[PDB]
Amino acid sequence: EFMLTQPHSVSESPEMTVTISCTGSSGSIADNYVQWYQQRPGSAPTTVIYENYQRPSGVPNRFSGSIDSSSNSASLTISGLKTEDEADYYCQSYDNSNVAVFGGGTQLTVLGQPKAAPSVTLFPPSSEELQANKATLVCLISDFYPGAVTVAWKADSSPVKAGVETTTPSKQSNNKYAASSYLSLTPEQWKSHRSYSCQVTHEGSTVEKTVAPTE
Amino acid sequence: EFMLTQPHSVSESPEMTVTISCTGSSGSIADNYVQWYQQRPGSAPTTVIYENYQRPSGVPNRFSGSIDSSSNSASLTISGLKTEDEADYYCQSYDNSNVAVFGGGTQLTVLGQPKAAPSVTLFPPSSEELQANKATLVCLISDFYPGAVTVAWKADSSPVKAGVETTTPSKQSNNKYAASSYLSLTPEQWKSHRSYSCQVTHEGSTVEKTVAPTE
Amino acid sequence: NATTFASVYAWNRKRISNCVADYSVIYNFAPFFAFKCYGVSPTKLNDLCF
Amino acid sequence: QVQLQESGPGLVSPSQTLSLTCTVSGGSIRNEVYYWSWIRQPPGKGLEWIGYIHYSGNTYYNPSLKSRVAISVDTSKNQFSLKLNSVTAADTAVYYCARVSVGGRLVSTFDYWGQGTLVTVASASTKGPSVFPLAPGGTAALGCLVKDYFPEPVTVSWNSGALTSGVHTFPAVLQSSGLYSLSSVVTVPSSSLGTQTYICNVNHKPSNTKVDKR
Amino acid sequence: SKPSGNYNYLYRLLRKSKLKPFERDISTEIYQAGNKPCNGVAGPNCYSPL
């Protein structure tokens, strides 16, 4: 058995040498080649390192690595890492019994990324949904840097707890986060109130919408 | 050169710690790996210490030591001395010119051994030797711990005038000595005398055989 | 049979041309610790020309 | 098991060239330790390193004996020899051949050794060995006598090595006439007269002399 | 192709002459191709038959 073990995450400032490690459990790292594959959220993995020292065309020369024979482990380093290099990496090897084993993956997090502000947006129910005898508020959140952002809902004059559903924030294509909030209610309750407000909690700021169903 | 130096002999009671030091008269002793070897009486040398702090398999844990370049002395300690440890020891190192030099040797003698009385055994010349117009008496001495044992010969009235040879005592493999004596004479003299005897002198005791050729 | 070889970072470069390449000398001496050949065979060295 | 055995001429003439041969078994010279050395030991003295030789030609001789020691090796017979020209009377010692561990970081670890032989370089009083039997309760004792032999490395045995219980040997001595003497006895019970007769065997290595007598 | 290596299948390294059509050769003698005899053992310039 050749079980490659990877750390959970690693962080380092850009424009430097960011090194990712990957250790093997047993066997022999010199018997089979070690490969590294880059995978981003919502996309298929892509080959980066093969034959433990080679790199295919189109990949920037920043991607490199070496094999440590003293500890039978693999390593991946980025000479001059930048914001676009923020993605997952998986070390892969092979067993002597012709068995391919993939690593656990390590989440690379760029520490040098600046702060950001959440783009709170609330959409009221449309005419089609009201004709369908239902209603659901959509409180979209985007462009927020921290992952500890929570959601909140407010009625016309007091807090309210309806059938609220909150999406888990995940990475975007531009290395930022995105989320969404839902609040379903009957049209009679929607018409029986003068306004509804979605509250988003951010680290050092907060934004409310206060959208009114009438006028 | 890399001329080492050892004490010629050392003695210590059993169940005690023995300190043995071999000094290098020329060159830094720590420049190369110093080894220690043990050569029991009547046997080939056996490796005891290598790499100056390591011991091979089969050797008891009573052998250990270290090297000090500031005093150019090869330290050696014998914890829990016993009877079987009575043997020679040699420190060996290597000169900077790849010249191997062995130490002068050190005889470890177990002083705490009990006293032992010498055994006497004598054999008269057989007829097969008398038919060759010659005769030789063989006397045997053994089982004696002290080296002050001497030899003596008489022929029924006085010591023998013929030449007598005496063997040099040496240690056996069982922590005891061994010796012998020889007396060469003509068969006419062997027949013209009444009796011969091999006298062995010990501290406060003496044993003889007094073998009679006639009757 | 040279007297001194250059270091590994400045290894010497020598070219052989216009001479009979009798490879029997390395077989007659044969002090080598290891001997390997690639592409060509050590038996047919004297049978080929380059 | 890795075993080494010394061999060669046991009798050398003064001011002549000494020659010895060491036999290696259980390993290959070219791979095992890559080095094999010679060590001599005077009677009652310590070991004295002579020199080792590598199968590729690397040699290192003793500076005190550089002009006399000549060492060669055979890369096929797994045997190496030793030559010593211009010998002196004081060169009589018990020679040995051993191996040196070099596969490690540095040269060390004289682990295995041979059996040794007392090479004599004196040519005076050169004679052949002779044997004489010795005359022999619940137990009995008897032995055999060997004299008139100048070469020291002699070997003795009892009953061809079968049932050697009670066999004891005594050190030799050099007589004034220039010949050594050896004595060995054996202790046996009185009821052992039925089988396993008391045969004493000798073998003179420098001359291949073998005599069997009771 | 066992995981620890399948050494049951062997091929002849070299021979003094090429094989004839349908000529089976099961000789296990140590093949020698140097300037010195090998005496049936794998010397410094000796090759195994398989």
Side-chain angles (χ1 to χ4, degrees):
Chain A
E1 289 289 342
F2 202 173
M3 182 179 180
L4 298 179
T5 303
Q6 305 192 216
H8 185 59
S9 298
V10 63
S11 60
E12 187 74 300
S13 300
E15 299 291 339
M16 298 181 60
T17 302
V18 184
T19 303
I20 303 181
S21 180
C22 155
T23 61
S25 62
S26 60
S28 180
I29 199 177
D31 299 0
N32 298 270
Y33 297 94
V34 182
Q35 283 71 216
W36 292 81
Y37 307 95
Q38 180 182 3
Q39 180 181 1
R40 308 192 74 262
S43 61
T46 304
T47 304
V48 174
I49 302 300
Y50 68 102
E51 298 189 14
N52 305 28
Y53 76 99
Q54 301 194 17
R55 177 181 62 259
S57 180
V59 186
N61 301 330
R62 306 180 302 270
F63 297 85
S64 58
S66 60
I67 298 300
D68 188 8
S69 180
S70 60
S71 61
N72 56 88
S73 301
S75 60
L76 182 67
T77 174
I78 310 298
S79 61
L81 183 137
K82 52 182 60 180
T83 60
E84 68 180 0
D85 300 330
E86 180 183 7
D88 297 327
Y89 296 94
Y90 297 81
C91 53
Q92 185 273 345
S93 180
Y94 300 86
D95 188 69
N96 298 330
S97 59
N98 194 20
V99 174
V101 180
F102 288 82
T106 299
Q107 172 63 76
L108 213 172
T109 300
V110 178
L111 186 60
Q113 293 182 355
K115 210 63 179 181
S119 299
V120 185
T121 306
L122 176 59
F123 287 95
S126 60
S127 60
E128 296 80 7
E129 188 174 9
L130 295 180
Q131 292 179 0
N133 199 20
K134 53 179 59 60
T136 297
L137 282 171
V138 181
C139 186
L140 298 172
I141 314 175
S142 60
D143 303 333
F144 57 101
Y145 179 82
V149 171
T150 60
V151 305
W153 289 88
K154 302 296 182 180
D156 181 67
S157 60
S158 61
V160 65
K161 181 58 183 300
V164 181
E165 301 293 336
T166 306
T167 65
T168 300
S170 62
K171 295 296 191 303
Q172 296 183 8
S173 60
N174 45 80
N175 302 92
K176 292 197 295 299
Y177 284 86
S180 179
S181 183
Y182 301 92
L183 183 138
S184 300
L185 78 167
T186 60
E188 182 68 22
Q189 182 182 0
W190 174 259
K191 296 180 300 180
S192 65
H193 287 260
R194 190 57 59 181
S195 60
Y196 291 90
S197 179
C198 175
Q199 184 182 9
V200 179
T201 300
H202 183 263
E203 299 181 359
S205 60
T206 172
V207 178
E208 61 280 353
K209 305 300 296 180
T210 320
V211 181
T214 60
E215 304 294 335
Chain B
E1 297 291 340
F2 212 95
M3 179 181 180
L4 303 179
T5 303
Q6 301 187 215
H8 186 59
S9 299
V10 62
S11 60
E12 185 76 306
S13 300
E15 301 292 338
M16 297 180 60
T17 302
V18 188
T19 300
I20 301 180
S21 180
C22 138
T23 63
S25 60
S26 56
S28 180
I29 188 179
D31 291 356
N32 299 274
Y33 297 154
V34 185
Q35 282 71 216
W36 286 87
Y37 309 94
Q38 181 180 3
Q39 179 182 0
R40 306 188 72 261
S43 62
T46 305
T47 303
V48 177
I49 302 296
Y50 71 104
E51 294 189 16
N52 307 17
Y53 74 97
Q54 300 188 14
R55 184 192 71 261
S57 180
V59 185
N61 301 84
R62 306 183 302 269
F63 299 88
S64 59
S66 60
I67 303 300
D68 188 8
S69 181
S70 60
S71 60
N72 62 87
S73 303
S75 61
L76 179 64
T77 170
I78 306 300
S79 60
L81 185 63
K82 50 187 60 181
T83 60
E84 67 180 2
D85 299 334
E86 181 179 4
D88 295 327
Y89 295 90
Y90 310 90
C91 58
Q92 186 274 343
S93 180
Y94 298 84
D95 200 334
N96 298 330
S97 58
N98 202 253
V99 175
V101 181
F102 288 84
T106 299
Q107 172 63 81
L108 209 167
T109 302
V110 182
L111 183 61
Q113 296 189 13
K115 203 65 177 182
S119 300
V120 189
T121 308
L122 182 62
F123 297 98
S126 60
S127 60
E128 291 77 11
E129 185 179 3
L130 297 180
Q131 291 180 0
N133 196 20
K134 57 179 59 60
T136 300
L137 286 76
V138 179
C139 187
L140 305 174
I141 309 175
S142 60
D143 300 0
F144 60 101
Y145 178 78
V149 178
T150 60
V151 302
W153 291 81
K154 311 286 184 176
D156 83 79
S157 60
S158 59
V160 186
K161 187 59 181 301
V164 181
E165 300 292 337
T166 305
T167 63
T168 300
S170 60
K171 292 297 198 307
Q172 298 182 3
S173 60
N174 48 82
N175 300 90
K176 292 199 299 298
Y177 268 98
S180 180
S181 182
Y182 300 92
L183 189 148
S184 300
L185 82 171
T186 60
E188 182 68 22
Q189 183 180 0
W190 169 261
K191 296 181 300 180
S192 63
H193 279 259
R194 185 56 57 182
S195 60
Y196 294 87
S197 180
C198 177
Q199 181 179 1
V200 180
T201 302
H202 190 258
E203 299 181 0
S205 60
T206 171
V207 180
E208 66 283 349
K209 303 300 296 180
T210 320
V211 182
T214 60
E215 304 294 336
Chain C
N1 203 261
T3 60
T4 296
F5 283 165
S7 299
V8 69
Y9 71 94
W11 53 278
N12 185 22
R13 186 68 171 184
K14 299 187 62 178
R15 181 181 179 180
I16 275 74
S17 180
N18 298 270
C19 58
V20 177
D22 190 8
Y23 308 104
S24 63
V25 287
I26 61 109
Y27 288 148
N28 184 27
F29 197 7
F32 314 141
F33 170 79
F35 183 83
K36 293 296 299 180
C37 294
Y38 304 95
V40 299
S41 179
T43 305
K44 59 184 301 181
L45 292 179
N46 57 273
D47 300 0
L48 297 180
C49 180
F50 306 95
Chain D
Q1 300 292 340
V2 182
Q3 298 180 181
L4 288 78
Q5 178 180 0
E6 288 77 5
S7 59
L11 183 61
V12 193
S13 179
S15 71
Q16 293 292 339
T17 63
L18 189 144
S19 300
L20 287 177
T21 302
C22 186
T23 301
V24 178
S25 60
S28 180
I29 286 185
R30 305 177 302 270
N31 188 27
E32 183 69 22
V33 286
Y34 305 94
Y35 271 92
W36 308 82
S37 180
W38 292 88
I39 292 93
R40 67 175 183 178
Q41 179 182 1
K45 300 300 180 180
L47 300 179
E48 184 175 1
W49 173 81
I50 300 180
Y52 32 74
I53 179 174
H54 191 33
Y55 90 101
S56 72
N58 300 271
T59 59
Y60 295 94
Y61 301 153
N62 194 313
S64 60
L65 306 181
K66 180 70 63 60
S67 60
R68 306 193 306 178
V69 168
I71 309 181
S72 60
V73 74
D74 196 328
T75 60
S76 60
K77 300 182 181 60
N78 299 331
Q79 297 179 0
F80 55 97
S81 60
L82 172 61
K83 299 186 62 179
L84 182 65
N85 58 88
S86 300
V87 297
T88 60
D91 297 330
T92 300
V94 188
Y95 292 84
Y96 279 82
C97 44
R99 71 180 198 178
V100 217
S101 301
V102 200
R105 281 166 275 96
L106 284 80
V107 187
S108 60
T109 317
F110 273 97
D111 42 356
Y112 281 81
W113 294 76
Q115 61 178 6
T117 169
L118 203 161
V119 181
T120 302
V121 298
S123 60
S125 68
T126 300
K127 296 181 59 59
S130 181
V131 297
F132 295 97
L134 300 180
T139 57
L142 77 165
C144 298
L145 177 61
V146 179
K147 293 178 58 181
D148 300 0
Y149 67 101
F150 184 80
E152 199 278 338
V154 298
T155 57
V156 296
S157 180
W158 284 83
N159 198 20
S160 300
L163 195 60
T164 59
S165 300
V167 176
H168 184 264
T169 59
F170 294 85
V173 64
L174 178 58
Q175 300 180 179
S176 180
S177 60
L179 290 315
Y180 293 86
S181 59
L182 185 59
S183 301
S184 179
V185 297
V186 55
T187 300
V188 287
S190 299
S191 60
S192 60
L193 299 180
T195 56
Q196 301 294 337
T197 60
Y198 312 140
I199 305 298
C200 60
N201 303 90
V202 296
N203 182 22
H204 191 268
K205 178 62 62 180
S207 61
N208 300 330
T209 301
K210 300 178 300 300
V211 182
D212 299 330
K213 193 181 301 300
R214 194 266 179 179
Chain E
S1 300
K2 299 181 299 181
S4 60
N6 194 332
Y7 302 93
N8 189 27
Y9 305 94
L10 296 82
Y11 67 97
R12 183 175 303 272
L13 183 55
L14 273 95
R15 205 190 66 163
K16 60 180 181 60
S17 300
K18 282 78 180 60
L19 288 184
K20 298 300 180 60
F22 305 98
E23 180 187 12
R24 182 181 295 101
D25 197 332
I26 334 179
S27 60
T28 179
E29 185 69 20
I30 298 298
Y31 173 72
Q32 50 181 358
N35 300 20
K36 49 95 61 60
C38 291
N39 300 330
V41 302
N45 192 20
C46 307
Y47 308 94
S48 62
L50 301 177

